[PDB]
Each structure stands twice: as C-alpha cells, then as structure tokens.
Scaffold this active site. Structure first.
Site, PDB file in Angstrom:
ATOM      1  N   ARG A   8     -23.461 -91.592  33.872  1.00 43.07           N
ATOM      2  CA  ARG A   8     -23.847 -90.257  33.401  1.00 43.07           C
ATOM      3  C   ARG A   8     -24.920 -90.354  32.292  1.00 43.07           C
ATOM      4  O   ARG A   8     -25.781 -89.473  32.156  1.00 43.07           O
ATOM      5  CB  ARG A   8     -22.614 -89.533  32.865  1.00 43.07           C
ATOM      6  CG  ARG A   8     -22.926 -88.294  32.070  1.00 43.07           C
ATOM      7  CD  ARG A   8     -21.735 -87.348  32.098  1.00 43.07           C
ATOM      8  NE  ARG A   8     -21.833 -86.305  31.078  1.00 43.07           N
ATOM      9  CZ  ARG A   8     -21.591 -85.013  31.289  1.00 43.07           C
ATOM     10  NH1 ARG A   8     -21.225 -84.575  32.495  1.00 43.07           N
ATOM     11  NH2 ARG A   8     -21.733 -84.151  30.290  1.00 43.07           N
ATOM     12  N   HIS A  13     -30.169 -89.465  30.160  1.00 40.95           N
ATOM     13  CA  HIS A  13     -31.125 -89.939  29.151  1.00 40.95           C
ATOM     14  C   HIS A  13     -32.123 -91.039  29.483  1.00 40.95           C
ATOM     15  O   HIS A  13     -32.956 -91.350  28.648  1.00 40.95           O
ATOM     16  CB  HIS A  13     -30.354 -90.402  27.894  1.00 40.95           C
ATOM     17  CG  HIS A  13     -29.202 -89.515  27.524  1.00 40.95           C
ATOM     18  ND1 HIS A  13     -27.870 -89.667  27.682  1.00 40.95           N
ATOM     19  CD2 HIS A  13     -29.384 -88.259  26.981  1.00 40.95           C
ATOM     20  CE1 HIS A  13     -27.278 -88.506  27.243  1.00 40.95           C
ATOM     21  NE2 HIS A  13     -28.214 -87.671  26.825  1.00 40.95           N
ATOM     22  N   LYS A  41     -28.642 -76.708  29.499  1.00 45.42           N
ATOM     23  CA  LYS A  41     -28.243 -77.612  28.423  1.00 45.42           C
ATOM     24  C   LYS A  41     -29.204 -77.301  27.272  1.00 45.42           C
ATOM     25  O   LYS A  41     -30.426 -77.277  27.454  1.00 45.42           O
ATOM     26  CB  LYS A  41     -28.352 -79.068  28.890  1.00 45.42           C
ATOM     27  CG  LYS A  41     -27.895 -80.084  27.873  1.00 45.42           C
ATOM     28  CD  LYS A  41     -27.748 -81.441  28.492  1.00 45.42           C
ATOM     29  CE  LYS A  41     -26.725 -82.266  27.758  1.00 45.42           C
ATOM     30  NZ  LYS A  41     -27.343 -83.522  27.274  1.00 45.42           N
ATOM     31  N   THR A  45     -32.509 -85.535  25.215  1.00 47.28           N
ATOM     32  CA  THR A  45     -33.546 -86.504  24.942  1.00 47.28           C
ATOM     33  C   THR A  45     -33.635 -87.439  26.152  1.00 47.28           C
ATOM     34  O   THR A  45     -32.619 -87.801  26.742  1.00 47.28           O
ATOM     35  CB  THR A  45     -33.191 -87.373  23.713  1.00 47.28           C
ATOM     36  OG1 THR A  45     -32.949 -86.527  22.586  1.00 47.28           O
ATOM     37  CG2 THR A  45     -34.310 -88.349  23.372  1.00 47.28           C
ATOM     38  N   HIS A 117     -22.737 -93.093  25.393  1.00 44.41           N
ATOM     39  CA  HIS A 117     -22.981 -91.817  24.740  1.00 44.41           C
ATOM     40  C   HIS A 117     -24.225 -91.871  23.871  1.00 44.41           C
ATOM     41  O   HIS A 117     -24.503 -92.881  23.223  1.00 44.41           O
ATOM     42  CB  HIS A 117     -21.740 -91.447  23.890  1.00 44.41           C
ATOM     43  CG  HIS A 117     -21.988 -90.369  22.874  1.00 44.41           C
ATOM     44  ND1 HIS A 117     -21.955 -89.025  23.188  1.00 44.41           N
ATOM     45  CD2 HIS A 117     -22.287 -90.440  21.558  1.00 44.41           C
ATOM     46  CE1 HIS A 117     -22.226 -88.317  22.109  1.00 44.41           C
ATOM     47  NE2 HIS A 117     -22.434 -89.150  21.106  1.00 44.41           N
ATOM     48  N   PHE A 118     -24.966 -90.770  23.876  1.00 31.71           N
ATOM     49  CA  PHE A 118     -26.181 -90.618  23.083  1.00 31.71           C
ATOM     50  C   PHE A 118     -25.736 -89.856  21.840  1.00 31.71           C
ATOM     51  O   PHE A 118     -25.431 -88.672  21.924  1.00 31.71           O
ATOM     52  CB  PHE A 118     -27.206 -89.764  23.835  1.00 31.71           C
ATOM     53  CG  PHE A 118     -28.537 -89.672  23.145  1.00 31.71           C
ATOM     54  CD1 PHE A 118     -29.424 -90.749  23.175  1.00 31.71           C
ATOM     55  CD2 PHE A 118     -28.885 -88.546  22.410  1.00 31.71           C
ATOM     56  CE1 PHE A 118     -30.627 -90.695  22.477  1.00 31.71           C
ATOM     57  CE2 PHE A 118     -30.080 -88.497  21.718  1.00 31.71           C
ATOM     58  CZ  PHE A 118     -30.948 -89.567  21.752  1.00 31.71           C
TER      59      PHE A 118
END
Length: 120
Positions: A8, A13, A41, A45, A117-118
């Site tokens: 994901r 990203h 959303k 980035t 995760h970002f």
C-alpha cells in the site's frame, strides 16, 4: 501484515520513473493510484526515487514518529506533494502540486525491514 502495508506504501507514495512536479501530475497519479476512489485524499506525497534507495532509509539511525514509537527514519528525497483544492469531489478531484527535494520521515517494520508508513 507488513507486506500488505509495504504494498500500500508503494502504491500511494512511490514513483521512481517520473519527476512529477505539476498539478496535472497530481490529478493523474492520485487517480491512477486509487486515492480518489470514494473521497479526495486531502494530502499525499510521491517519492521519485528508486525502490532500493527508499528501503535503504530503513537502515538509518532511529528517530521518533509522530505517534511516539521509535521505528521511524529520515531521508532527503525528490518528492511531489499533492494538496486537494476543495473545488470538487471524487472522482473529479483537483490538486495543486509543489515539487522539492526535502526531508521525509517514514516508518519501517519487519525482518527484513520494509517501509510501512509515510510519517511526514
């Protein structure tokens, strides 16, 4: 679950092939990457670096995530930040883009480690 999370993360990203940097690029990619499916959303980035350059950020010294955990890492990379304009709703979401090479923060998990995760 880190493999579902890693996948994901890539879809949302990662885009090494392009340099983006324009509103049109945001409008297209946000859609193509499935982030305007049901709702626009608000902010996203895109990282324009090689997948291995990004998995390699997981190996830098640990720093604090916004949530308190210490499994985050930082790196300076070329990115395109897309911000929803609020003019319209999915599926016709319109974004404004800003290009830069900036410091980003990501969370890595698993063994071997992968970005899941970002953070910022």
């Amino acid at each position: 679950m880190q493999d579902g999370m890693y996948q994901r993360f890539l879809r949302q990203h990662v885009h090494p092939e392009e340099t983006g940097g324009s509103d049109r690029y945001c409008n297209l990619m946000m859609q193509r990457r499935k982030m305007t499916l049901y709702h626009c959303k608000r902010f996203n980035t895109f990282i324009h670096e090689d997948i291995w350059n990004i998995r390699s950020i997981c190996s830098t010294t640990n720093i604090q995530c916004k949530n308190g955990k210490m499994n985050c890492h930082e790196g300076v990379v070329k990115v395109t930040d897309c911000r929803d304009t609020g003019s319209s709703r999915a599926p016709n979401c319109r974004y404004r883009a800003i290009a830069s090479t900036r410091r980003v923060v990501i969370a890595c998990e698993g063994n071997p480690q992968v970005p899941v995760h970002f953070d910022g």
